[PDB]
Amino acid sequence: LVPVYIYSPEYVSMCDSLAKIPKRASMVHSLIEAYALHKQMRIVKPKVASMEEMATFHTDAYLQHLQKVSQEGDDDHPDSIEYGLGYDCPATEGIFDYAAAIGGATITAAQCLIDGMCKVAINWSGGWHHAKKDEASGFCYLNDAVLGILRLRRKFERILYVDLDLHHGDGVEDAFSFTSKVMTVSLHKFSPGFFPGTGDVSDVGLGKGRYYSVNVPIQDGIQDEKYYQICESVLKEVYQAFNPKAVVLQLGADTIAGDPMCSFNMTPVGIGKCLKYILQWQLATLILGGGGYNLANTARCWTYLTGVILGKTLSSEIPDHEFFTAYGPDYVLEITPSCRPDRNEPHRIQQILNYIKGNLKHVV
Ligand SMILES: CC(/C=C/C(=O)NO)=C\[C@@H](C)C(=O)c1ccc(N(C)C)cc1
Ligand SMILES: CC(/C=C/C(=O)NO)=C\[C@@H](C)C(=O)c1ccc(N(C)C)cc1
Ligand SMILES: [Ca+2]
Ligand SMILES: [Ca+2]
Ligand code: NA
């Protein structure tokens, strides 16, 4: 009944251990702990993913490469560019243990769901949706979202994956594009030159998986009310057509106003309405983080969302804690909307929604 919270001091240290990658995990946990929300949850220490468990999705060659680079390298390896390592996925020591930790945490969350320990299990340090079987991409060395889905698939026949990160969940979609057993639904920015470039409304999966991928392309500057209307429209149609047995929900906070991504104009309240809608299905739900690069804002967001999972309304005052100064100058939980135009034309949104509805008529 109480949500599972995947946490250990070791796990947070590991998630924060990569050189030059900013130290977000501790900020997120510390804020949740400052609000004492961990006391309302079942704190579960994550296992570390074994080679075999990561190999459920990732190829041997890619994993072995990740391990070699994690030990000795940064440069000096011929295969690293092809394996996707570089600027947005740096080759630095510990990347393999980092990946193992996050993969293991999400799998642990899934296992908790399978065992009926909880109906909601949270890994705020996961959601790394871009990684492919054989390739790192966009901060994702390992696709823990895919690993979570595959773990859930041990018990639950049909999984719905919902990706509310600013970016297209291409790695997860690709993993499951050829099957009807997993439906992926991604809302994301879709614009010429915008990472990773994929996820147009016309991308619907392939083969046995045709029409079991859903992509919702959204433009800059969308705010809470409009986003939720879109999200609810699509998810209502998805739930009725697909009838998921479990849900994996990726809640990247890079949609939030003030993010360096400077794209969407959301607040945690808007994302929270989407979360509430999904939670109301009362299915086993695995909650992941993802992007989120205004670190304080991301902690504000996921803390707030932890609150909605718990059905609690949190104080607007940020409580004193380790990273309190990071919340200045206002020291409040709430995020303001930037003064930025909403580039989403109602008519285009309706067209997109009509198209998805047409597609979902083939499900399933
Ligand atoms: C990869 C990504 C986000 C993905 C995501 O959020 N997945 O959902 C954004 C790219 C476009 C980017 O802007 C960037 C910025 C800085 C940087 N370093 C400082 C190393 C590396 C990449
Ligand atoms: C995207 C960005 C800034 C872009 C910009 O445009 N800045 O101006 C910075 C990245 C490095 C970042 O902050 C980050 C944090 C955590 C993380 N993981 C927990 C995997 C991966 C990346
Ligand atoms: Ca394999
Ligand atoms: Ca089977
Ligand atoms: Na997304």
Ligand code: NA
């Ligand atoms: Na699919």
Ligand SMILES: [Zn+2]
């Ligand atoms: Zn993102």
